[PDB]
Amino acid sequence: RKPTHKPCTDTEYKCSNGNCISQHYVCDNVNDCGDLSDETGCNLGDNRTCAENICEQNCTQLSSGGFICSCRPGFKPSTLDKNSCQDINECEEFGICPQSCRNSKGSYECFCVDGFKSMSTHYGERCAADGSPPLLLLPENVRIRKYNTSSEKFSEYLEEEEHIQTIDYDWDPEHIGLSVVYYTVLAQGSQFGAIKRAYIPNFESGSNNPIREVDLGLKYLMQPDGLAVDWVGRHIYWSDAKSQRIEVATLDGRYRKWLITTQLDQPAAIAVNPKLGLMFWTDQGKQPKIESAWMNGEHRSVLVSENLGWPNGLSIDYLNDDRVYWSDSKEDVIEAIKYDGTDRRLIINEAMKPFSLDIFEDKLYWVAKEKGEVWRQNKFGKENKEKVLVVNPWLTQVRIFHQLRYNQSVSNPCKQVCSHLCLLRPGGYSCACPQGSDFVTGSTVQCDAASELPVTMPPPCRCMHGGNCYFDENELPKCKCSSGYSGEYCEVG
Amino acid sequence: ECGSGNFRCDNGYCIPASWRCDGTRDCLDDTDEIGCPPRSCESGLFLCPAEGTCIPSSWVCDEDKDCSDGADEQQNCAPRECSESEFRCADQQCIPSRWVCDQENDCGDNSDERDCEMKTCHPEHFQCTSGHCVPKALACDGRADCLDASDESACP
Amino acid sequence: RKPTHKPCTDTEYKCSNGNCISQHYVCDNVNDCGDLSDETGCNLGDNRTCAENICEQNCTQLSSGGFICSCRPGFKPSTLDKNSCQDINECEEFGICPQSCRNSKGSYECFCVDGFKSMSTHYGERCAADGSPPLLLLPENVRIRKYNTSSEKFSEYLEEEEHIQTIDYDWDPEHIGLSVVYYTVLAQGSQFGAIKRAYIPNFESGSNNPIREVDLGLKYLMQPDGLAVDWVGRHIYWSDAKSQRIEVATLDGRYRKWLITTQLDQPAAIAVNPKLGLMFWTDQGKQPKIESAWMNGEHRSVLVSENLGWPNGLSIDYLNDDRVYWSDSKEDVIEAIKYDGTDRRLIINEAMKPFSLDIFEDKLYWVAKEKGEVWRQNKFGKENKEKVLVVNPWLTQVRIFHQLRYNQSVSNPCKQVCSHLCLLRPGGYSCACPQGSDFVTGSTVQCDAASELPVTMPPPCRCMHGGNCYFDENELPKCKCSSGYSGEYCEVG
Amino acid sequence: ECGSGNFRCDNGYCIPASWRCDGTRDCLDDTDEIGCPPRSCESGLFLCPAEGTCIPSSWVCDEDKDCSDGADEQQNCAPRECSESEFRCADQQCIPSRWVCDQENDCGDNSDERDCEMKTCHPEHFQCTSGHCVPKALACDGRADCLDASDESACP
Ligand SMILES: *[C@@H]1O[C@H](CO)[C@@H](O[C@@H]2O[C@H](CO)[C@@H](O)[C@H](O[C@@H]3O[C@H](CO)[C@@H](O)[C@H](O)[C@@H]3O)[C@H]2NC(C)=O)[C@H](O)[C@H]1NC(C)=O
Ligand SMILES: *[C@@H]1O[C@H](CO)[C@@H](O[C@@H]2O[C@H](CO)[C@@H](O)[C@H](O[C@@H]3O[C@H](CO)[C@@H](O)[C@H](O)[C@@H]3O)[C@H]2NC(C)=O)[C@H](O)[C@H]1NC(C)=O
Ligand SMILES: *[C@@H]1O[C@H](CO)[C@@H](O[C@@H]2O[C@H](CO)[C@@H](O)[C@H](O)[C@H]2NC(C)=O)[C@H](O)[C@H]1NC(C)=O
Ligand SMILES: *[C@@H]1O[C@H](CO)[C@@H](O[C@@H]2O[C@H](CO)[C@@H](O)[C@H](O)[C@H]2NC(C)=O)[C@H](O)[C@H]1NC(C)=O
Ligand SMILES: *[C@@H]1O[C@H](CO)[C@@H](O)[C@H](O)[C@H]1NC(C)=O
Ligand SMILES: *[C@@H]1O[C@H](CO)[C@@H](O)[C@H](O)[C@H]1NC(C)=O
Ligand SMILES: *[C@H]1O[C@H](CO)[C@H](O)[C@H](O)[C@H]1NC(C)=O
Ligand SMILES: *[C@H]1O[C@H](CO)[C@H](O)[C@H](O)[C@H]1NC(C)=O
Ligand SMILES: [Ca+2]
Ligand SMILES: [Ca+2]
Ligand SMILES: [Ca+2]
Ligand SMILES: [Ca+2]
Ligand SMILES: [Ca+2]
Ligand SMILES: [Ca+2]
Ligand SMILES: [Ca+2]
Ligand SMILES: [Ca+2]
Ligand SMILES: [Ca+2]
Ligand SMILES: [Ca+2]
Ligand SMILES: [Ca+2]
Ligand SMILES: [Ca+2]
């Protein structure tokens, strides 16, 4: 904070950083400015004058050697035709703007994209969520818990379960105001696990809406350490650690196809980016690595494999250049790399062994595994860590439940041509059919495996402002509306 | 060959002409999007290929990085190891391959019974509709050796 | 269930168990009844007749040998003057009556003591709690949770704490309707733990009454694995595992005195029985044992030391002959012994490593440690186990929060004569003074250590049927009464 | 000796006569409750000593167990080991005794600083009002070697 301090007079060269050095020291071939900004240009000669219009900007006549010119603030020496200066593209700096950056001549704007109202805040400006405050999804081995970040209160949700694992959700597929979350069940004793799905209300209701669990039928499954839902392609990607493979199936569990089965030691949590048509996953075996590939499964490549411990949680910052973040529970650090793998930088260290991470707004969320705590920090590595809540050591993940985290206006490129599955890929799509089947000879669309009807989900309980759900003789849900509200679902009153 | 209104990709699969230059790689060889003129902008302005936004003739050839790619200044202005035949259970233990889903938990945690639907039974074993592997002598005998009873169903 | 089945005629001797054996087999010196009940008396002779009135009851004339007499049902051969039978004292049988037993001639009554209404139940009769349904106190390392057994719902209680351990409570000391619980804090890093106490409402209020924690000032304390509160003597007994001692102090933490400091490897949870003036504690070190002593500390003795694994939780059945139960987390069994140490019998096995136990009504409660579950079973070893709830692995104890568990009408024998402490003992009391001090010479009451004033507890929040507590300018609590209720504490409306 | 209204126990501590036969062991030798006639019951009935409940003359001498004690039929009818001088920390580690609460955490977890209020400082060390042990040369010097500043307080 400085209006103006320690001004430099005519005798003192102002430099580019306020280095108040005497004029005789300018262009003496010795750097006093600390960045050679006092040796700028260094085109010298006594018979020359500044009036000739040699330099583009800040042309001053030195006492000796003629004219010596510098750059306007926000500009740098061009290293060619040194009497000229070009604009610094400040948008390339990491963490200079919260959401978006536009370049100007020595200036920039921290605009933020649609769906984000600019909100001046403390120690910098951010952009709000333009909707209901985000929720947190906390899976314990027996139950799933919700947490309103702004209201700061829990709510009864899925209970009476066993061995819960990673969580992912699909925002309101039927637009009836109910999103669906997907949770995996570990295999205990001699019984296989499963991938189950259930509804969750986007509104404030809870503790009175009996959630009914339904299995997808994906039998012969042991340890789904990682799961991700492609909302564009309507496919669910999960990685079985014991089966040493990462595979794909439709949202209702049909047409199971193995996607990647080679060179996988222990596939950890995965992620998908339908906008770029790129899937990401982590391996935490004897050779830790972070790999990305197309949703089809082609062009598999390794992003980072150096200075990696136990990469066990990975998430993508969709709204910031599709940047990729991951959590290392062994090195105790959280790092970020661009989706192509360049510009690696650690974001936060001494993270106390983060297990899972999820990015929302200008802040990063991660779980201290052994401490059972959820921690919050600026997602660009600045500031200091903040604690959120303390929960059981059974906690396995933190996941933000909001719609802006998954851009819902990403159109699916599929033209309905595909018979069974239509996987995504950069700039387009592709056809595929279940495992143990092949295309009809001569065609790359039809496959010989017989089609299967989509699975029907039972009706959900929907009492928004209050009331209790109830099962009638045919078990359709019905709400007993509270005071001051009416309707089939107690909406208006 | 196909109709006049269907554009043909290199592999022989031909697609409707409306899908050409539609922004999506419709066919596998992605030739349906190559050889298409990029979107143009009015005179006095240029559009950055990586951004799709028009910028004026002043912003290009300004000796600095105006477009995101910045090519304008030079493109416009110019655990013991198991054997090969040993089946690996979940607990890293190695077991003989004869235990592969004989409908009885051998590896523990029913690892041997895992997903033997895609894999095929060996010639010495009979494959029934559940995918479980049973000896060929245990088919068409009046007793359901397979728990799905497909052994007694695939009989004359 | 039998009105009468397989009746025995005159020729068939009915026996004491329905052994329909022929009359010629009676008193043939070979047991056909299975208990020699067919050889009863065996006073034989043909010239003798039953009319002589030789036997007291059931005198019958055998076809040969004269008269042969048996015992009335509910009576046994006396083994002396065999023609006579005495009454079986059925009250000595374990688990024959739920709460109390009175003996009669071949009969008994399962009466239950004051404060227990007889309630016929399924598979046997029990006696109710004559009050609000019992609560459960579940200490997690960060928070304490409550659970209404009948309402089956949680309630917000003490939170924002660290390293909680064993729990004990004192029922409504001031009779203002607020009981006080005592919780110990483990020592973390290089900071000592403490013994803190706080209020808890006996009524249904919760989630809106800010509970204020206060430390007792018992500094220099590391690991209080066990704690018990003597409601009669107004003293608190705790056992420090690291300090290898079990000591006593008054309820407000004054006049600390070491009680037992010798031959203690790892003192586990303890218990006190003011009615008998006997303290009980368990050692889970290299030599497991269950020891009892007077509250004074004299007459220390070992109750059981054989077939013991890790005795880590102990509780006393006050209402049933002051019987003692304990939980063994290594042998995986829960056993019961009389307070003098005879009649040892395992109650339930395959208990899945119980950690703490607490007895209430006709049922026994224990915590499956690694499973984090609370389990319920008949306290007399019959029936089959029942599960209650599933909670975090941070669970450390289950404790029933009810007044009938601690008989409040046990008068303190102390005559206020004692200067600092008045410990209890069988049939009376005793005098003592803090550690590092001794009695004034010639007297066994006064001690030289200067007295200290009792500690003042801050006022609590009291809003029964509803409302929110609030702190005024002098921080006195005040409730904002809900609709349809009025009063300073919203009692009547 | 004491007043006529005070009953004397064997140790010399004499107690008021009202406390005699009051049901509580008032004095240590408990002689204030011995030599007192047990509570009696009306004729034709007997009171079990262990129960305090009267039962009739018919119930006694009935050749069975009427009272809880049942005496009526025969009483009425008739990790390396540390040295001796080594201080034990909480972590079983043995340390020299010079570390006992020198106000600096030596054993870890401040085990050496535990409860040195009842124990007395050794002659070579000065004891201040917090109970912490400091060398005798660190008393009355103008600086608070004890954190409670009692070293500079107990001075002439
Ligand atoms: C979620 O993804 C959608 C695309 O599926 C994004 O919508 C696009 O956002 C850009 C931002 O500037 C708009 O220009 C797009 O509008 C259209 O753009 C095309 C050129 O590509 C023009 O020819 C059209 O005339 C029009 O201006 C817009 N496209 C659509 C289909 O809405 C959206 O920004 C993104 N949202 C988030 C929060 O990431
Ligand atoms: C909690 O302890 C109290 C004693 O502190 C128990 O109260 C006593 O219970 C017995 C049960 O039958 C009663 O007789 C007692 O009444 C009195 O008993 C004496 C003889 O000891 C007589 O002389 C008196 O006339 C009177 O009948 C009763 N004593 C008191 C002081 O109430 C109580 O049962 C017990 N409660 C529970 C639930 O354990
Ligand atoms: C999470 O908490 C916020 C408040 O911090 C809730 O937002 C308000 O919800 C009420 C519900 O009736 C609305 O009437 C208000 O208009 C909302 N205020 C704002 C700031 O939008 C939000 O609904 C809560 N969400 C859940 C699911 O609990
Ligand atoms: C525990 O639950 C029981 C109900 O199962 C509660 O008992 C009732 O409480 C209400 C409170 O207004 C009383 O009006 C009823 O008369 C009670 N019924 C019975 C059977 O007594 C009990 O209050 C609950 N206790 C707590 C602390 O939650
Ligand atoms: C020269 O630099 C000054 C700041 O020192 C600035 O105000 C002025 O606009 C500049 N002029 C030119 C021509 O660069
Ligand atoms: C003899 O036994 C019968 C039951 O078999 C019983 O009903 C009867 O009262 C008994 N009589 C005597 C005198 O014991
Ligand atoms: C079917 O395929 C499996 C997996 O490759 C085995 O090779 C098996 O032997 C095959 N069965 C036959 C009959 O060839
Ligand atoms: C005080 O007592 C402790 C503990 O017994 C030590 O013996 C110490 O040496 C004593 N101090 C003195 C001065 O004798
Ligand atoms: Ca210089
Ligand atoms: Ca700029
Ligand atoms: Ca196309
Ligand atoms: Ca340019
Ligand atoms: Ca098998
Ligand atoms: Ca067969
Ligand atoms: Ca016989
Ligand atoms: Ca009887
Ligand atoms: Ca007395
Ligand atoms: Ca008798
Ligand atoms: Ca020390
Ligand atoms: Ca000093």
mmCIF file of N, CA and C in Angstrom, chain A residues 119-146:
data_model
loop_
_atom_site.group_PDB
_atom_site.id
_atom_site.type_symbol
_atom_site.label_atom_id
_atom_site.label_comp_id
_atom_site.label_asym_id
_atom_site.label_seq_id
_atom_site.Cartn_x
_atom_site.Cartn_y
_atom_site.Cartn_z
ATOM 1 N N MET A 119 -18.065 -10.569 -6.301
ATOM 2 C CA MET A 119 -18.331 -10.191 -4.914
ATOM 3 C C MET A 119 -17.004 -9.779 -4.285
ATOM 4 N N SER A 120 -16.855 -8.485 -4.014
ATOM 5 C CA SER A 120 -15.678 -8.016 -3.298
ATOM 6 C C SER A 120 -15.620 -8.661 -1.920
ATOM 7 N N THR A 121 -14.449 -9.181 -1.568
ATOM 8 C CA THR A 121 -14.265 -9.923 -0.333
ATOM 9 C C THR A 121 -13.008 -9.434 0.371
ATOM 10 N N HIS A 122 -12.705 -10.074 1.494
ATOM 11 C CA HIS A 122 -11.592 -9.648 2.328
ATOM 12 C C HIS A 122 -10.299 -10.258 1.795
ATOM 13 N N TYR A 123 -9.258 -9.429 1.688
ATOM 14 C CA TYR A 123 -7.965 -9.828 1.121
ATOM 15 C C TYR A 123 -8.109 -10.325 -0.317
ATOM 16 N N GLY A 124 -8.911 -9.621 -1.107
ATOM 17 C CA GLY A 124 -9.084 -9.952 -2.512
ATOM 18 C C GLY A 124 -10.538 -10.179 -2.873
ATOM 19 N N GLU A 125 -10.836 -10.065 -4.164
ATOM 20 C CA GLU A 125 -12.196 -10.219 -4.659
ATOM 21 C C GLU A 125 -12.395 -11.607 -5.251
ATOM 22 N N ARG A 126 -13.588 -12.158 -5.047
ATOM 23 C CA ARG A 126 -13.968 -13.463 -5.570
ATOM 24 C C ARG A 126 -15.343 -13.346 -6.219
ATOM 25 N N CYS A 127 -15.835 -14.460 -6.753
ATOM 26 C CA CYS A 127 -17.137 -14.500 -7.404
ATOM 27 C C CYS A 127 -17.994 -15.590 -6.771
ATOM 28 N N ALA A 128 -19.243 -15.244 -6.465
ATOM 29 C CA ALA A 128 -20.111 -16.081 -5.651
ATOM 30 C C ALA A 128 -20.624 -17.280 -6.447
ATOM 31 N N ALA A 129 -21.456 -18.091 -5.792
ATOM 32 C CA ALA A 129 -21.913 -19.351 -6.362
ATOM 33 C C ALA A 129 -23.228 -19.240 -7.120
ATOM 34 N N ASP A 130 -23.901 -18.089 -7.067
ATOM 35 C CA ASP A 130 -25.117 -17.850 -7.850
ATOM 36 C C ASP A 130 -26.134 -18.974 -7.627
ATOM 37 N N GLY A 131 -26.329 -19.339 -6.368
ATOM 38 C CA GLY A 131 -27.264 -20.403 -6.060
ATOM 39 C C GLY A 131 -27.192 -20.779 -4.598
ATOM 40 N N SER A 132 -27.783 -21.925 -4.288
ATOM 41 C CA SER A 132 -27.766 -22.426 -2.923
ATOM 42 C C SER A 132 -26.332 -22.739 -2.509
ATOM 43 N N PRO A 133 -25.950 -22.469 -1.264
ATOM 44 C CA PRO A 133 -24.579 -22.745 -0.822
ATOM 45 C C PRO A 133 -24.227 -24.210 -1.005
ATOM 46 N N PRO A 134 -22.975 -24.506 -1.346
ATOM 47 C CA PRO A 134 -22.593 -25.893 -1.624
ATOM 48 C C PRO A 134 -22.697 -26.770 -0.389
ATOM 49 N N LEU A 135 -22.983 -28.045 -0.624
ATOM 50 C CA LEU A 135 -23.003 -29.062 0.413
ATOM 51 C C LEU A 135 -21.731 -29.893 0.343
ATOM 52 N N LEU A 136 -21.477 -30.641 1.410
ATOM 53 C CA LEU A 136 -20.379 -31.590 1.451
ATOM 54 C C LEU A 136 -20.930 -32.994 1.648
ATOM 55 N N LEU A 137 -20.361 -33.946 0.916
ATOM 56 C CA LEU A 137 -20.765 -35.346 0.991
ATOM 57 C C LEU A 137 -19.638 -36.122 1.657
ATOM 58 N N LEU A 138 -19.905 -36.639 2.852
ATOM 59 C CA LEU A 138 -18.892 -37.288 3.680
ATOM 60 C C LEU A 138 -19.238 -38.757 3.877
ATOM 61 N N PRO A 139 -18.584 -39.671 3.165
ATOM 62 C CA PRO A 139 -18.921 -41.093 3.294
ATOM 63 C C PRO A 139 -18.206 -41.782 4.445
ATOM 64 N N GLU A 140 -18.963 -42.268 5.422
ATOM 65 C CA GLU A 140 -18.446 -43.156 6.451
ATOM 66 C C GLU A 140 -18.800 -44.598 6.112
ATOM 67 N N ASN A 141 -18.074 -45.530 6.733
ATOM 68 C CA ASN A 141 -18.193 -46.938 6.369
ATOM 69 C C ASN A 141 -19.591 -47.491 6.601
ATOM 70 N N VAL A 142 -20.412 -46.813 7.399
ATOM 71 C CA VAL A 142 -21.776 -47.243 7.669
ATOM 72 C C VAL A 142 -22.810 -46.297 7.080
ATOM 73 N N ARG A 143 -22.490 -45.012 6.943
ATOM 74 C CA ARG A 143 -23.487 -44.023 6.559
ATOM 75 C C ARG A 143 -22.878 -42.893 5.741
ATOM 76 N N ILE A 144 -23.726 -42.110 5.084
ATOM 77 C CA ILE A 144 -23.315 -40.918 4.354
ATOM 78 C C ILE A 144 -23.926 -39.705 5.035
ATOM 79 N N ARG A 145 -23.119 -38.670 5.241
ATOM 80 C CA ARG A 145 -23.559 -37.475 5.939
ATOM 81 C C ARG A 145 -23.466 -36.264 5.023
ATOM 82 N N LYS A 146 -24.399 -35.337 5.204
ATOM 83 C CA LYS A 146 -24.437 -34.084 4.469
ATOM 84 C C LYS A 146 -24.063 -32.935 5.394
#
